[PDB]
Amino acid sequence: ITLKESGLTLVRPTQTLTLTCTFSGFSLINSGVGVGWIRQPPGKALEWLALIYWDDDKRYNPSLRSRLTISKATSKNQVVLTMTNMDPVDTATYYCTHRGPGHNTPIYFEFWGQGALVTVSS
């Protein structure tokens, strides 16, 4: 199981950030499986963006709701994250992470991406 992010790493303010986690080794059709996104600013603590279970249960970070949209292209084995009205405070590293099943309870964030440095500037 491998994950990899992609999108635009540089975007102007008042624009939108898009990211695509393309994975290999699991399918969002089995039970348990879900995919989420987690950001971390440079030199700050981690931050949770959004989550999507296998039955399409789109959990969001409440404080970060009303700005985010996550969607799937299962045919392409990929997940899309979108955040509008980007700002200089949103300069961070963005990981796409995977939550699957364990041995007696669902696992969360067992696998991480490799990040995608996102700068919001000019």
Binding site: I29, N30, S31, W54, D55
Partner: protein, 49 residues
């Protein structure tokens, strides 16, 4: 031979005392040959219940 004739003295001659029959040495699993089952790994390994 005495047992068949029920007599302690048997006279000269030829007598048919008994029969023999070679016994089976083995059993051969009694089977036709199969090929396929039904859907069980599609009812217990189902993705969503």
């Amino acid at each position: 031979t005495k047992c068949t004739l029920k007599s302690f003295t048997v006279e000269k001659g030829i007598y048919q005392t008994s029969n023999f029959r070679v016994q089976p040495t083995e059993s051969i699993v009694r089977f036709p040959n199969i090929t396929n089952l039904c859907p069980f790994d599609e009812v217990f390994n189902a993705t969503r219940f």
